[PDB]
């Protein structure tokens, strides 16, 4: 499980 | 929970008006993190933050990595159907 997730605007 | 099929109509010069996070590399679905005011998702309705996007235009997003989902989502045009479930 990763603490950091990318977040992308579409 | 209920899987909703949600319609959104987009002009070519517009974005979807959503932000997404999550993905296979994090062990979670593609999740909606924001709905941007005034853009197609907001105008058309039916999507909400925390929704997992299971499919878009019949293309399965269940086991996609984040960048894969960005690609597929960004390539959809016009009348777009999402299948989502709130998590």
Explain what you see.
The complex is a heterodimer of chains A (10) and B (87). Chain A is an all-beta fold and 10 residues long. Helix content of chain A is 0%, strand content 20%. The radius of gyration of chain A is 9 Å and the shape is rod-shaped. Chain B is of the alpha+beta class and 87 residues long. Chain B has a single domain, classed as Pdz3 Domain (Roll). Chain B is built from two helices and six strands, in the order βββαββαβ. In chain B, strand 2 and strand 3 form a beta hairpin. Chain B is globular and about 30 Å long. The interface between A and B is medium-sized, with 8 and 20 residues. Strand 1 of chain A pairs antiparallel with strand 2 of chain B, so a sheet runs across the interface. The PDB classes it as peptide binding protein/protein binding. The entry lists the keywords PDZ domain, CAL, pist, FIG, PDZ-peptide complex, CFTR Associated Ligand, cftr, PEPTIDE BINDING PROTEIN-PROTEIN BINDING complex. The assembly is dimeric.
């Amino acid at each position: 499980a990763n603490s950091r997730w990318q977040d992308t605007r579409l | 929970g209920p899987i909703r099929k949600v319609l959104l109509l987009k002009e070519d010069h517009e974005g979807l008006g959503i932000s997404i996070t999550g993905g296979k590399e994090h062990g979670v679905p593609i999740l909606i993190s924001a709905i941007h005011p005034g853009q197609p998702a907001d105008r058309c309705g039916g999507l909400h933050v925390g929704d997992a996007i299971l499919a878009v235009n019949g293309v399965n997003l269940r086991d996609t990595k984040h960048k894969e989902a960005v690609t597929i989502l960004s390539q959809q045009r016009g009348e777009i159907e999402f299948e989502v479930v709130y998590v």
